[PDB]
């Protein structure tokens, strides 16, 4: 996240990382007790068989004892285009179940077709860059941003931070955006650089995918 701020520890449970041997990459959501969700170029190109999925987490750098850690047992796309990166989504079922807790939470998908006006506000969040020769988040970060609709295709949720240059940026793919306690994006792609000022952040429309959402995981 580029110009964001860091999250209270463990202020949402459904946060998680995706890792490479210890290595964050993407972001994903819990969205059931053995499913997550995050973006499907994260996993498209990625050894999967290595992915571990880390719940509960709140600093990459030190030893937590609130994670659970999981591994991929199958993977669910939905007609995923890695060329225009459309419906960039893909559902992570897990090798167990977590353990729900204080720290550990599932996350509240909206429903079907719901859309999202112009001007509403949401939340995003992720581990990944932090700008232009600012490095890496080790504590989560979390932004506030606006959705828009113009300069977005009608296949995506985008979102603009009004007033200065911020945004997502590599390593926020996979996370979740949040509008009135639901998961309405997840963070898909920038245009001319993260936090460019001129193009919104992309997210994919988990409201267009909500009945093939519920299809698997029910
Ligand atoms: C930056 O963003 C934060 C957080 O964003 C909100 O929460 C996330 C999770 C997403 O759902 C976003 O869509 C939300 O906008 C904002 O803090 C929130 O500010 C609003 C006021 O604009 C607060 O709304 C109040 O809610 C009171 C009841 O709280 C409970 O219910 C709300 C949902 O209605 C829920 O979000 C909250 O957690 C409680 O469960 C209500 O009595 C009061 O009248 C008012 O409506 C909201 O509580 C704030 N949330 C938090 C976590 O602080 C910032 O305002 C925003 N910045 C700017 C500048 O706008
Ligand atoms: C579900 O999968 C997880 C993760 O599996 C790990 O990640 C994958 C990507 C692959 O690289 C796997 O080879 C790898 O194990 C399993 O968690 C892991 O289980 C093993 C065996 O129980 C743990 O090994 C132990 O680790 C402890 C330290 O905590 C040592 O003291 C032991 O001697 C032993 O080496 C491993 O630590 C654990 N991973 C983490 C991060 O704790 C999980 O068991 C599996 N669940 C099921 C039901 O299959
Ligand atoms: C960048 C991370 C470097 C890294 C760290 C630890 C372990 C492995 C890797 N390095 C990969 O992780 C590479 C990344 C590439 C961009 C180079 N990636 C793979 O090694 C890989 C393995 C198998 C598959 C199978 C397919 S094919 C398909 O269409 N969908 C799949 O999952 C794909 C990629």
Redesign the pocket.
């Given at each position: 996240i580029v110009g964001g701020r860091r999250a209270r520890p463990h202020a949402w449970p459904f946060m998680v990382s995706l890792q490479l041997r210890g290595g964050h990459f993407c972001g994903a959501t819990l969205i059931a007790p053995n499913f997550v969700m995050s973006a499907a170029h994260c996993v498209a190109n990625v050894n999967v068989?290595?992915?571990?999925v880390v719940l509960g987490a709140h600093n990459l750098s030190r030893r937590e004892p609130t994670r659970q850690?999981?591994?991929?047992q199958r993977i669910f796309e939905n007609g995923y285009d890695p060329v225009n990166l459309l419906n960039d989504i893909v559902i992570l079922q897990?090798?167990?179940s977590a353990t729900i807790n204080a720290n550990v939470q599932v996350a509240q998908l909206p429903a079907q077709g719901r859309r999202l006006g112009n001007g509403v506000q949401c939340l995003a969040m992720g581990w990944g860059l932090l700008g232009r020769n600012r490095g890496i988040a080790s504590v989560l970060q979390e932004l506030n941003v606006t959705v828009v609709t113009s300069l977005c295709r009608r296949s995506n949720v985008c979102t603009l931070v009004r007033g200065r240059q911020a945004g997502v940026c590599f390593g926020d793919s996979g996370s979740p955006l949040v509008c009135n306690g639901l998961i309405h994006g997840i963070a898909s792609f920038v245009r001319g650089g993260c936090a460019s000022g001129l193009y919104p952040d992309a997210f994919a429309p988990v409201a267009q995918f909500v009945n093939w959402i519920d299809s698997i995981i029910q």
């Open positions: 068989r290595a992915v571990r850690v999981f591994a991929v897990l090798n167990g």
